[PDB]
């Protein structure tokens, strides 16, 4: 009975006729998502469960007539509004029980509107452009919710990818042109203290001033940060971060791997291909002048004598947003440095390459730091370039030759080429023909 | 192309048919793609069975234009 | 064709035999359908009609040759 | 051709530390005890120039010093010439280099071998 049910929503759903019968569709999509309708008149039809009610002509009033959703059901797009849909149902999908449901989407809309005050209270400061305030802004570029989606803090945006095939954002930045995290509440076994109205009552004009807890309840939940893509982090950053926050990052300690590893997997499963690349971390990489290969070297010992090691974050909880400051700028210290190392990870079959192969290599020297080691340009003593990601957005590298060498390079000039464009395979690139050029 | 057009119908009818008598009885994947893929293959040839009756009754005019002429010239 | 299907399969939900009778003589409007003057393909469309063109052209050409053809001074 | 050039003939390619030393051999017909080539000499260069060593370098010399290729005497002599102390990983590894030897700090060969070795520590 049941599947004869689901057996209708799928047949309705190739079903495409005319307004009516695309009123059945309506109906249709309701019964996909196992969603109730009740429709009063043609022109209205609701679909109900817990709060997710909503009308195509609990606690809240009818938000906002998002052009969104209306403008793909006003075009043949269906399916676009059942993903929609599907957004929403899973915002929802909170375990809670009835008025603790409403109190906790409260406290959703409590963070919100906070967030949204310091996103505003960095533009008031500085009027900085769209990038800057994805690149070192308070907060991040904030989208506020529309229908299912939430709120997506855009943390990091990579000179390499900013760039497609030098695009200049305006207001118009894409959702997912970039990294982006979502903020959002989810029920946990423990139970957690958190702000039930805007804690934002008076704000210090520089920076923001949080009035003290007590409202809040003790909801059996915590606020998120989910990220969509697991973002691999090393563990002295778990330690970092927890120094600020103090909720454990990964509770139950679970798998703790080589960092390098994880940074491949990312990199390589951003594109996926049905050949595993059975790189043997000898990534190979081609460029416009010159041919180079990587070892990424991970097992190199670090000073404590423990090989770099870090397990993929997906989740990060935060009572306040008086510690997401703080998180959020260590965090964006792991991504970029992830990006800098990850630009290398590529899936080509250089086989059997007898000119150039300018080989360079990856050795981690300490948490934050690793050398890229190659052959003099000009001369012949192994010399080296360090990067240490200090900072999401800032890396201080130094080249140090032997005693008797050639100038290789100025540190200011790849500076300058790195940021006009980017990618790190690209850095070793920018020495060799520096170099090469005096 | 006549024959791929009926067997395309009987082929609809029958299976819509079977999915809604199961559905009626409980109170079918399979059968919608079945139906979906000859549905695709009736309407594309339904805009030309149309325009083919126009083109039928215009081959009509042209072939009396046609046999008058040749009778007249015999 | 396809509409009725689906029109048939709603009744099928909402329950009726006489729908099911309706989409019998729907089915016997089909073969209407396969044959009211249907009997070729696009490409026989094509020549047929190349064909009728070339017969119109060459008939009024030599009506044309003996229009011409004046027997009397 | 120069040993600066092997050795990252042998780090390029990822060469395993055994088979760094056959193709050490194959590149050089002349031993030459490897000290006259000063190879603690180039090892210590192309390993101790980034923040941290490579541990592949680091691999060569402890495989090259824990076989007897390099005498204890030219390493303790390029041991000497890194200073620079602003690096602390660098350091840790050149003492742990210097674990590797000290107290065995044996010579069995000539006694101007034995003088460098005074010479050295």
């Known amino acids: ?64 007539s998002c052009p969104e959703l209306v403008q793909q059901l006003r075009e043949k797009n269906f399916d676009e509004f059942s993903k929609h ?88 930045v894409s959702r997912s042109l970039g990294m982006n995290a979502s903020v959002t509440i989810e029920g946990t076994s423990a139970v957690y203290k958190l702000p039930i109205a805007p804690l934002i009552m008076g704000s210090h004009p520089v920076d923001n001033k949080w009035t003290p807890s007590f409202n809040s309840v003790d909801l059996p939940a915590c606020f998120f940060l989910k990220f969509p893509q697991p973002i691999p982090v090393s563990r002295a950053f778990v330690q970092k971060l927890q120094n600020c926050t103090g909720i454990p990052l990964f509770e139950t300690q679970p798998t703790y791997a080589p960092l390098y590893e994880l940074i491949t997997q990312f990199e390589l499963s951003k594109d996926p291909d049905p050949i595993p690349l059975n790189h043997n971390m000898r990534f190979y990489a081609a460029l416009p002048g010159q041919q180079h290969c990587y070892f990424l070297n991970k097992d190199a010992p670090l000073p404590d004598g423990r090989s770099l090691q870090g397990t993929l974050v997906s989740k990060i909880t935060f009572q306040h947003p008086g510690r997401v400051p703080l998180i959020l700028n260590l965090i964006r210290h792991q991504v970029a440095y992830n990006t800098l190392i990850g630009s290398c990870v590529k899936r080509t079959i250089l086989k059997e390459d007898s000119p150039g192969l300018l080989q360079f290599e990856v050795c981690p020297l300490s948490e934050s730091r690793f050398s890229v080691s190659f052959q003099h340009p000009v001369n012949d003593s192994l010399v080296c370039v360090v990067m240490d990601v200090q900072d999401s957005t800032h890396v201080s590298c130094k080249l140090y030759k032997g005693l008797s060498d050639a100038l290789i390079c100025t540190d200011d000039f790849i500076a300058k080429v790195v940021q006009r464009c980017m990618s790190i395979p690209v850095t070793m690139r920018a020495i060799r023909r520096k170099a090469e050029t005096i | 192309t006549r024959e791929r057009l009926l067997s395309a119908l009987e082929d609809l009818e029958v299976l819509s048919r079977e999915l809604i008598e199961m559905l ?51 | 064709f396809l509409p009725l299907v689906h029109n048939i399969i709603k009744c099928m939900d909402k329950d009726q035999d006489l729908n099911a009778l309706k989409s019998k003589f729907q089915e016997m409007r089909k073969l209407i359908s396969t044959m ?34 004046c027997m009397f001074e | 051709v120069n040993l600066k050039q092997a050795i990252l003939q042998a780090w390029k390619e990822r060469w395993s530390d055994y088979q760094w030393a056959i193709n050490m051999k194959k590149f050089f017909p002349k031993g030459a005890t490897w000290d006259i080539l000063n190879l603690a000499d180039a090892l210590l260069e192309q390993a101790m120039i980034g923040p941290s060593p490579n ?43 210097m674990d590797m030897f000290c107290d065995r700090l044996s010579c069995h060969g000539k006694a101007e071998e034995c003088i460098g070795l005074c010479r050295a520590l």
């Open chain 1, 1 to 64: 009975q049941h599947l004869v049910s689901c057996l209708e929503t799928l047949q309705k759903a190739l079903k495409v006729t005319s307004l009516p019968a695309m009123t059945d569709r309506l109906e249709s999509i309701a019964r996909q998502n196992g969603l109730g309708s009740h429709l009063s008149a043609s022109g209205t039809e609701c679909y109900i469960t817990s709060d997710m009610f909503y009308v195509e002509v609990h606690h809240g009033e009818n938000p906002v």
């Open chain 1, 85 to 172: 849909l599907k957004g929403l149902v899973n915002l929802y999908n909170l375990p809670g029980d009835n008025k603790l449901k409403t109190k906790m989407y409260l406290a959703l809309q409590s963070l919100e509107q906070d967030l949204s005050k310091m996103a505003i209270m960095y533009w008031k400061a500085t009027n900085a452009g769209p990038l800057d305030k994805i690149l070192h802004g308070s907060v991040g570029y904030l989208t506020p919710r529309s229908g299912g989606h939430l709120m997506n803090l855009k943390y990091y945006v990579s000179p390499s990818d900013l760039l497609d095939d030098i695009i200049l954002h305006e207001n118009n």
């Open chain 2, 24 to 74: 009626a009885i409980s109170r079918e994947n399979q059968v919608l793609e079945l139906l979906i893929h000859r549905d695709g293959e009736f309407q594309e040839l339904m805009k030309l069975a149309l325009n083919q009756g126009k083109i039928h009754h215009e081959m009509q005019v042209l072939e009396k234009e046609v046999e008058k002429r040749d009778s007249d010239i015999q």
């Open chain 3, 36 to 69: 009211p003057g249907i009997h070729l393909s696009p490409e026989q469309q094509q020549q047929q009609l190349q064909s009728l063109r070339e017969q119109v052209r060459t008939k009024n050409e030599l009506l044309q040759k003996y229009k011409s053809l």
């Open chain 4, 55 to 97: 541990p592949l370098i680091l691999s060569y010399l402890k495989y090259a010093i824990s076989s007897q290729m390099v005498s204890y005497s030219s390493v303790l002599t390029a041991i000497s010439k890194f200073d620079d102390f602003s690096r602390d990983l660098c350091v840790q590894a050149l003492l742990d280099i």
